[PDB]
């Protein structure tokens, strides 16, 4: 094989090729094993799980910035209002297995030419599909970087205390037809996406509450109150009060999501516990974070600087890190203000309904609602996709689903790209000279390495807007920085690591609502 | 592949094949990095730069003596008045990668058969083109010598103190389609030069100020002065004064370039600072040496022996050296006296113009000019090409350029030969047995080696001159020397190194101007 | 006819249609007349002129913002590195002539259906071509605006005191074949531009003084000085001093242009006279402003904020004005920093040449040059084109010209778009009832109006850059403003006038030099 990394922009299509180097350790000493956690220690009963670890490992390209560069992403988002995937091609090649030997004085590495690796793509979705969970192990952003393939594992149904039950499944992965790859062999796979709507690559320049001609007034008459005697009063909505207008549509549904302020210290209460104040959804006796939830506006236009939602936004690392508690300077915190036309700001309880029934004695009373769900006549927008975020998710296999668009972002797929698994074939050490029936537990220490190339085909929308004035676009505003410490933003720094300086998203072009 | 080195002289064409052995180290520990220098120390603010180092490396054949031998160069310059390039072919083959292992007791080297190297030619001129800067790393003069490929790096725009700015670019070189070469694979590349005028391979046997018939006198009348009363006087130019002649043409433009004397000690001022007395051109707040400048005659015919210009000539090493301050006996200092017909001697301020306006009271006054630039009706000659000098340069991509002939010498090309880059593919060491998301920073120590052959096609002019007397030609005038210390000049010396004894150039044949 | 205004973006082409309403007064009472100014009063002798006024009037579309909108210009300059014109179509139609009558009590306007207007395009360039002088009368930026056609006039050769001479020409414009247009008639004209190079739509990300590999050092030896005894010293340029490098190319030529600071008050001398400190070029006994001159960098990267050149930049009005001395808040002052790679900052006298000839007694001396003109081996860039600036100029008809690119900006054309002239046909009042031989000086007061549409065809370059990091682009950065006083920037304000908020230009994309 050869190294193919390039991008080609056709009129409505763009092709992205990228190729990378990987390394595969032997996981688990060639052994499966059960794993669980019960609720006796640590987080608690809500953290319990049960499942299996597997000697196999797998490839994950599911993030965007695997397939694009900050220049190719800019070229996409300033000129195009939509994108969707078409097909992909995967090729792993130049596989070479290496044996490791240690005398405790030094470690020797040799090249074993007859060893193989096993690889198969799961076509029929027989194994539990772990790709859409936004975990680590994805290809690096920067092509010169070498990455390590993650170990495959899954969770099954659990009883109390994180124990197996009857419905719990155990999957043997050697019961699948696979291909063995020596040096000189390659593995290729074709895939074609199902028809999916374009993602919306535009911000919106109007609002639902103002769709009208502001000079006019309605031919519909409203109810302005009652008289002092109890007689109904009428009123016509007009340009002096436009909130009075009747309207055909309503904004998005919501659950109230607590607000947090990232920039301003003085806007936040002291010592709040983010575990207690997060939205939860419970299932099966325990309850998990509902996050990010259904997308609400993080902030609206006139607003305090730094306003956000608590666990209502996506947050990324500037560079890959294990920190587990990163500092605020190491993160890219997204802002979704572009949906503020159809999507209300979370933690704003504006909606108001009637809580009683009037009569002569009783005055009508109303109240504000913390949770207001979907009813006919509502319109909303999906969460934006980011250069650092997931491309797709797998829609669960179930009897019903409502607007099956992933809550993290991207494209819900009924048949997503299949999960490609790989392991090192075991090579046993010298057996005894008399026959033993027991399984052979002694093996030769080895690992694999090679290249993998991913070629993706995309479908874009170019538009014609007749607005006169210019539009906001994504530009590089940094003043200088310092080649001696931090390099070019979106480039290699002094220590050699690649840094993604700020989060980027697809909505820079306005379109009237 | 096979070893092809030969030269074939056809009538108007000559083909030069040469092949060499190279070695490629791993540069930068597989890491990019930012580089800068500010003006706080060392040379000063004029020395500041900013850019990136790359793990890649590249081939440079841009000097002539890569493609020719002192005998083939002599055969060219005595019989031919012009040369230009036509096409070239590049082939790198017999690539073999080697692993290095050290116990601190000894260093072991082994041959890894499955490792690869990556190579690509930059066709579209996407990367900054560093070849035309006359830096080191070129193929050796002598074919039996083994050379090392230089590391690739570039400069971007800089702010003050050598810092990056918005316009500063970062180029990832793994974003290019490349070819992987094991043992048994080769990389070939074809290139064809654009149409370019022949270089002038002749000295000139006349002068601009004498183009005339010396026996005759003009039908044009001159202005010989005014009378004692103020009446205009006329004069006819004739064989007694030939400087009086009117003329259709004028010599080359110039900037005054200070003179230095290489041979004679007693002609030079004591302790001059070559940094202060060099011509500069400033750009972007700082100023760089203007060197060599636009070519002026280093010396003219009747002149002091050893006369030259300060930073107005090219100077070479007799053999490749790192000295950084070589002795005068280790250098080949060129002399351009062959343009003395159309090109005036630098540091001669001869040109004279009128500095006032006469009338009855005011006598006319004139002055000599230090800088006299291009005006209609001028003719000049380009700098000569040398066996040790650069073949081509890349004309910058810009809206305008005037006479785009390189100032060092050779052929300005809008599409020069592309820059061929190569690196060793990284082979990682054994990973841990549990998954880590961080990039893998431990690799196996290795290097590459192989052969590269370059085949160039040239176009020459043979002439017929009707002069009677013989012409000067390039001959070997050395008396004897000493096989015990210095071998044959233009040959291997006692220590084994190859020495180029004196500088050679293409103008030995006279032609009337 | 119909109203056609739209823009269509094809792959390499873009078509711009725009149509406007005009009004044509009767100029000069149907009379030609001589005009002059002598140097006795006012500005002085340098302001003298002589020529003729004409009853005719003409169309001028020569500015860019006639053909583009701020959104279509943004779409051009962020995605494209070059533009050139191809052809144009002009159509004037819906012509209606109106008679005016006054009783001194009121003014009556009536519609005369049989009156005509005369129109012709000057194909052969027989009349003096006044279009390329950047004067007023151009189509408005905003299509709903109604504009007035300017009166045609020209200058001829003059003697002293602004008087006619023998060579002075008088042109009768009724000696040309023209077309008469009633209501229901239209005038159409086709034109096709000559082949012209693309304008450079990119900023440049490198510099001439750094084109090299910064890690390496040269095989060319320099001259570092002389010894204390007078012996020549040598030095090798290397990464510690990169200004020492020999180089094939040199930056732009210049004339020194005085600097002015627009933003900072404290950087400017008090009460300078811009007429005395401007560069001049004299011709024919008098001297005119040389402005802007040949383009130099207004400012370079690390620099004081507000730095500019005095009469070295273009300056525009935010909205069309007669002010004649506009305030600094009413103007758009351009900045050209994008050429700072090949073009030195004006009013920086960096260049240094040798002013003497050394010997034992005399030390070498140098000096800085105020004016350094074109010599072989220089590269520069042309002035940028702006949304508010001229599209083309007419190259004078002359025996020689050097780099005939207009100094204001745009495309020098040997055959530019011809000049289209129009007048109202005279309608005489009632003659006497006895014959008089004298010319008839009494006419009916009238004016014309109609629509004109201009359809232009353009040729654009789209590029592929392999830089990784993103590029700067043109965006709308204004925070809010105030619908009650100033509307959307690049939109109608409260009083109804159209305002162009800031100057825009075509170089936002970096490309290595």
JSON list of N, CA and C in Angstrom, two decimals, chain A residues 394-431:
[
{"chain": "A", "resi": 394, "resn": "UNK", "atom": "N", "xyz": [-25.78, 5.31, 16.46]},
{"chain": "A", "resi": 394, "resn": "UNK", "atom": "CA", "xyz": [-26.62, 4.20, 16.05]},
{"chain": "A", "resi": 394, "resn": "UNK", "atom": "C", "xyz": [-27.98, 4.31, 16.73]},
{"chain": "A", "resi": 395, "resn": "UNK", "atom": "N", "xyz": [-29.03, 4.41, 15.95]},
{"chain": "A", "resi": 395, "resn": "UNK", "atom": "CA", "xyz": [-30.37, 4.46, 16.53]},
{"chain": "A", "resi": 395, "resn": "UNK", "atom": "C", "xyz": [-30.68, 3.12, 17.17]},
{"chain": "A", "resi": 396, "resn": "UNK", "atom": "N", "xyz": [-31.08, 3.07, 18.44]},
{"chain": "A", "resi": 396, "resn": "UNK", "atom": "CA", "xyz": [-31.37, 1.78, 19.07]},
{"chain": "A", "resi": 396, "resn": "UNK", "atom": "C", "xyz": [-32.45, 1.02, 18.32]},
{"chain": "A", "resi": 397, "resn": "UNK", "atom": "N", "xyz": [-32.42, -0.29, 18.46]},
{"chain": "A", "resi": 397, "resn": "UNK", "atom": "CA", "xyz": [-33.36, -1.15, 17.76]},
{"chain": "A", "resi": 397, "resn": "UNK", "atom": "C", "xyz": [-34.55, -1.35, 18.69]},
{"chain": "A", "resi": 398, "resn": "UNK", "atom": "N", "xyz": [-35.66, -0.69, 18.37]},
{"chain": "A", "resi": 398, "resn": "UNK", "atom": "CA", "xyz": [-36.78, -0.53, 19.28]},
{"chain": "A", "resi": 398, "resn": "UNK", "atom": "C", "xyz": [-38.03, -0.28, 18.47]},
{"chain": "A", "resi": 399, "resn": "UNK", "atom": "N", "xyz": [-39.17, -0.42, 19.14]},
{"chain": "A", "resi": 399, "resn": "UNK", "atom": "CA", "xyz": [-40.45, -0.31, 18.45]},
{"chain": "A", "resi": 399, "resn": "UNK", "atom": "C", "xyz": [-40.82, 1.13, 18.14]},
{"chain": "A", "resi": 400, "resn": "UNK", "atom": "N", "xyz": [-40.31, 2.09, 18.90]},
{"chain": "A", "resi": 400, "resn": "UNK", "atom": "CA", "xyz": [-40.62, 3.48, 18.61]},
{"chain": "A", "resi": 400, "resn": "UNK", "atom": "C", "xyz": [-39.53, 4.41, 19.06]},
{"chain": "A", "resi": 401, "resn": "UNK", "atom": "N", "xyz": [-39.43, 5.53, 18.35]},
{"chain": "A", "resi": 401, "resn": "UNK", "atom": "CA", "xyz": [-38.48, 6.59, 18.61]},
{"chain": "A", "resi": 401, "resn": "UNK", "atom": "C", "xyz": [-39.05, 7.86, 18.04]},
{"chain": "A", "resi": 402, "resn": "UNK", "atom": "N", "xyz": [-38.76, 8.98, 18.69]},
{"chain": "A", "resi": 402, "resn": "UNK", "atom": "CA", "xyz": [-39.31, 10.26, 18.28]},
{"chain": "A", "resi": 402, "resn": "UNK", "atom": "C", "xyz": [-38.17, 11.18, 17.89]},
{"chain": "A", "resi": 403, "resn": "UNK", "atom": "N", "xyz": [-38.18, 11.62, 16.64]},
{"chain": "A", "resi": 403, "resn": "UNK", "atom": "CA", "xyz": [-37.17, 12.48, 16.04]},
{"chain": "A", "resi": 403, "resn": "UNK", "atom": "C", "xyz": [-35.80, 11.89, 16.36]},
{"chain": "A", "resi": 404, "resn": "UNK", "atom": "N", "xyz": [-35.44, 10.77, 15.75]},
{"chain": "A", "resi": 404, "resn": "UNK", "atom": "CA", "xyz": [-34.22, 10.07, 16.17]},
{"chain": "A", "resi": 404, "resn": "UNK", "atom": "C", "xyz": [-32.94, 10.77, 15.73]},
{"chain": "A", "resi": 405, "resn": "UNK", "atom": "N", "xyz": [-32.71, 11.96, 16.26]},
{"chain": "A", "resi": 405, "resn": "UNK", "atom": "CA", "xyz": [-31.49, 12.68, 16.01]},
{"chain": "A", "resi": 405, "resn": "UNK", "atom": "C", "xyz": [-30.63, 12.67, 17.27]},
{"chain": "A", "resi": 406, "resn": "UNK", "atom": "N", "xyz": [-29.37, 12.27, 17.17]},
{"chain": "A", "resi": 406, "resn": "UNK", "atom": "CA", "xyz": [-28.55, 12.11, 18.38]},
{"chain": "A", "resi": 406, "resn": "UNK", "atom": "C", "xyz": [-28.44, 13.40, 19.17]},
{"chain": "A", "resi": 407, "resn": "UNK", "atom": "N", "xyz": [-28.43, 13.27, 20.48]},
{"chain": "A", "resi": 407, "resn": "UNK", "atom": "CA", "xyz": [-28.40, 14.44, 21.34]},
{"chain": "A", "resi": 407, "resn": "UNK", "atom": "C", "xyz": [-27.02, 15.04, 21.49]},
{"chain": "A", "resi": 408, "resn": "UNK", "atom": "N", "xyz": [-25.96, 14.28, 21.22]},
{"chain": "A", "resi": 408, "resn": "UNK", "atom": "CA", "xyz": [-24.64, 14.88, 21.19]},
{"chain": "A", "resi": 408, "resn": "UNK", "atom": "C", "xyz": [-24.42, 15.64, 19.89]},
{"chain": "A", "resi": 409, "resn": "UNK", "atom": "N", "xyz": [-24.86, 15.07, 18.79]},
{"chain": "A", "resi": 409, "resn": "UNK", "atom": "CA", "xyz": [-24.83, 15.73, 17.50]},
{"chain": "A", "resi": 409, "resn": "UNK", "atom": "C", "xyz": [-24.64, 14.69, 16.42]},
{"chain": "A", "resi": 410, "resn": "UNK", "atom": "N", "xyz": [-24.70, 15.15, 15.19]},
{"chain": "A", "resi": 410, "resn": "UNK", "atom": "CA", "xyz": [-24.44, 14.26, 14.08]},
{"chain": "A", "resi": 410, "resn": "UNK", "atom": "C", "xyz": [-25.65, 13.56, 13.50]},
{"chain": "A", "resi": 411, "resn": "UNK", "atom": "N", "xyz": [-25.43, 12.38, 12.93]},
{"chain": "A", "resi": 411, "resn": "UNK", "atom": "CA", "xyz": [-26.39, 11.70, 12.09]},
{"chain": "A", "resi": 411, "resn": "UNK", "atom": "C", "xyz": [-26.81, 10.39, 12.75]},
{"chain": "A", "resi": 412, "resn": "UNK", "atom": "N", "xyz": [-28.08, 10.29, 13.12]},
{"chain": "A", "resi": 412, "resn": "UNK", "atom": "CA", "xyz": [-28.61, 9.01, 13.57]},
{"chain": "A", "resi": 412, "resn": "UNK", "atom": "C", "xyz": [-28.74, 8.06, 12.41]},
{"chain": "A", "resi": 413, "resn": "UNK", "atom": "N", "xyz": [-28.16, 6.87, 12.55]},
{"chain": "A", "resi": 413, "resn": "UNK", "atom": "CA", "xyz": [-28.15, 5.89, 11.48]},
{"chain": "A", "resi": 413, "resn": "UNK", "atom": "C", "xyz": [-28.75, 4.59, 11.97]},
{"chain": "A", "resi": 414, "resn": "UNK", "atom": "N", "xyz": [-29.65, 4.02, 11.18]},
{"chain": "A", "resi": 414, "resn": "UNK", "atom": "CA", "xyz": [-30.18, 2.70, 11.50]},
{"chain": "A", "resi": 414, "resn": "UNK", "atom": "C", "xyz": [-29.16, 1.62, 11.17]},
{"chain": "A", "resi": 415, "resn": "UNK", "atom": "N", "xyz": [-28.39, 1.81, 10.10]},
{"chain": "A", "resi": 415, "resn": "UNK", "atom": "CA", "xyz": [-27.26, 0.96, 9.75]},
{"chain": "A", "resi": 415, "resn": "UNK", "atom": "C", "xyz": [-26.02, 1.84, 9.72]},
{"chain": "A", "resi": 416, "resn": "UNK", "atom": "N", "xyz": [-25.35, 2.02, 10.85]},
{"chain": "A", "resi": 416, "resn": "UNK", "atom": "CA", "xyz": [-24.16, 2.86, 10.86]},
{"chain": "A", "resi": 416, "resn": "UNK", "atom": "C", "xyz": [-22.99, 2.13, 10.25]},
{"chain": "A", "resi": 417, "resn": "UNK", "atom": "N", "xyz": [-21.83, 2.78, 10.12]},
{"chain": "A", "resi": 417, "resn": "UNK", "atom": "CA", "xyz": [-20.64, 2.07, 9.71]},
{"chain": "A", "resi": 417, "resn": "UNK", "atom": "C", "xyz": [-20.32, 0.96, 10.70]},
{"chain": "A", "resi": 418, "resn": "UNK", "atom": "N", "xyz": [-20.06, -0.24, 10.21]},
{"chain": "A", "resi": 418, "resn": "UNK", "atom": "CA", "xyz": [-19.83, -1.37, 11.10]},
{"chain": "A", "resi": 418, "resn": "UNK", "atom": "C", "xyz": [-18.52, -1.23, 11.85]},
{"chain": "A", "resi": 419, "resn": "UNK", "atom": "N", "xyz": [-18.41, -2.02, 12.91]},
{"chain": "A", "resi": 419, "resn": "UNK", "atom": "CA", "xyz": [-17.31, -1.96, 13.85]},
{"chain": "A", "resi": 419, "resn": "UNK", "atom": "C", "xyz": [-16.28, -3.01, 13.46]},
{"chain": "A", "resi": 420, "resn": "UNK", "atom": "N", "xyz": [-15.05, -2.57, 13.22]},
{"chain": "A", "resi": 420, "resn": "UNK", "atom": "CA", "xyz": [-13.98, -3.40, 12.68]},
{"chain": "A", "resi": 420, "resn": "UNK", "atom": "C", "xyz": [-13.07, -3.82, 13.82]},
{"chain": "A", "resi": 421, "resn": "UNK", "atom": "N", "xyz": [-12.92, -5.12, 14.02]},
{"chain": "A", "resi": 421, "resn": "UNK", "atom": "CA", "xyz": [-12.20, -5.65, 15.17]},
{"chain": "A", "resi": 421, "resn": "UNK", "atom": "C", "xyz": [-10.95, -6.38, 14.71]},
{"chain": "A", "resi": 422, "resn": "UNK", "atom": "N", "xyz": [-9.92, -6.37, 15.55]},
{"chain": "A", "resi": 422, "resn": "UNK", "atom": "CA", "xyz": [-8.61, -6.91, 15.20]},
{"chain": "A", "resi": 422, "resn": "UNK", "atom": "C", "xyz": [-7.94, -7.42, 16.47]},
{"chain": "A", "resi": 423, "resn": "UNK", "atom": "N", "xyz": [-7.19, -8.52, 16.34]},
{"chain": "A", "resi": 423, "resn": "UNK", "atom": "CA", "xyz": [-6.36, -9.01, 17.42]},
{"chain": "A", "resi": 423, "resn": "UNK", "atom": "C", "xyz": [-5.11, -9.67, 16.85]},
{"chain": "A", "resi": 424, "resn": "UNK", "atom": "N", "xyz": [-4.12, -9.85, 17.72]},
{"chain": "A", "resi": 424, "resn": "UNK", "atom": "CA", "xyz": [-2.93, -10.61, 17.40]},
{"chain": "A", "resi": 424, "resn": "UNK", "atom": "C", "xyz": [-3.20, -12.09, 17.60]},
{"chain": "A", "resi": 425, "resn": "UNK", "atom": "N", "xyz": [-2.93, -12.90, 16.59]},
{"chain": "A", "resi": 425, "resn": "UNK", "atom": "CA", "xyz": [-3.06, -14.34, 16.76]},
{"chain": "A", "resi": 425, "resn": "UNK", "atom": "C", "xyz": [-2.05, -14.83, 17.79]},
{"chain": "A", "resi": 426, "resn": "UNK", "atom": "N", "xyz": [-2.47, -15.68, 18.73]},
{"chain": "A", "resi": 426, "resn": "UNK", "atom": "CA", "xyz": [-1.54, -16.16, 19.75]},
{"chain": "A", "resi": 426, "resn": "UNK", "atom": "C", "xyz": [-0.51, -17.11, 19.16]},
{"chain": "A", "resi": 427, "resn": "UNK", "atom": "N", "xyz": [0.73, -16.97, 19.61]},
{"chain": "A", "resi": 427, "resn": "UNK", "atom": "CA", "xyz": [1.80, -17.90, 19.27]},
{"chain": "A", "resi": 427, "resn": "UNK", "atom": "C", "xyz": [2.28, -18.55, 20.56]},
{"chain": "A", "resi": 428, "resn": "UNK", "atom": "N", "xyz": [2.03, -19.84, 20.76]},
{"chain": "A", "resi": 428, "resn": "UNK", "atom": "CA", "xyz": [2.40, -20.46, 22.03]},
{"chain": "A", "resi": 428, "resn": "UNK", "atom": "C", "xyz": [3.90, -20.69, 22.15]},
{"chain": "A", "resi": 429, "resn": "UNK", "atom": "N", "xyz": [4.35, -20.75, 23.40]},
{"chain": "A", "resi": 429, "resn": "UNK", "atom": "CA", "xyz": [5.73, -21.10, 23.70]},
{"chain": "A", "resi": 429, "resn": "UNK", "atom": "C", "xyz": [5.90, -22.61, 23.62]},
{"chain": "A", "resi": 430, "resn": "UNK", "atom": "N", "xyz": [7.10, -23.08, 23.93]},
{"chain": "A", "resi": 430, "resn": "UNK", "atom": "CA", "xyz": [7.39, -24.49, 23.76]},
{"chain": "A", "resi": 430, "resn": "UNK", "atom": "C", "xyz": [6.59, -25.34, 24.74]},
{"chain": "A", "resi": 431, "resn": "UNK", "atom": "N", "xyz": [5.84, -26.32, 24.26]},
{"chain": "A", "resi": 431, "resn": "UNK", "atom": "CA", "xyz": [5.07, -27.17, 25.15]},
{"chain": "A", "resi": 431, "resn": "UNK", "atom": "C", "xyz": [5.96, -28.19, 25.82]}
]
